[PDB]
Amino acid sequence: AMGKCSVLKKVACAAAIAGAVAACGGIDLPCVLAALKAAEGCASCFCEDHCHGVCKDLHLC
Amino acid sequence: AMGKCSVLKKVACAAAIAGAVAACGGIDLPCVLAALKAAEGCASCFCEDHCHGVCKDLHLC
């Protein structure tokens, strides 16, 4: 029902995030955030150790 | 002179760049950008080799 960027399927990070990462050099959050707010395959897989601003602002960790 | 945040007053980065660290808890960039625009005191001290995240967004390098 409700699961916009929820848990369990957050391991799908190695797909959407992997492709979004290649859109900004590789391994970024402030810049990659633009394509990070799409679908439900993010969460505490990417912005886990990266919980400073941009992504943490939307609460993904 | 006409040089806001130019390559000279780069040494003054110890105030805005080192200050933004304590402002957002730690050092990085995603959230450090906020207190980075403190008039100036930025220059080639930030965004140099760190021109990946918001550092390129707020063109400095």
The per-residue DSSP string of B1-61 comes to: ---TT-TTGGGGHHHHHHHHHHHTSS-SSTTTTGGG-BSB--GGGSSSTT-SSHHHHT---
Architecture of the domain defined by A1-61: Orthogonal Bundle (1.10)
In chain A, what residues touch B26 (CB-CB under 8 Å)?
Answer: 52
In chain A, what residues touch B32 (CB-CB under 8 Å)?
Answer: 52-53
Helix (H) or strand (E) run with residue A21 in it: helix A13-21
CA of A42, closest CA in chain B: separation in Å? Answer: 17
Burial B32-60 (b: 16+ CB within 10 A, else e): bbeebebebbbbebbbeebebbbbbeeeb
Residue type at position A36: L
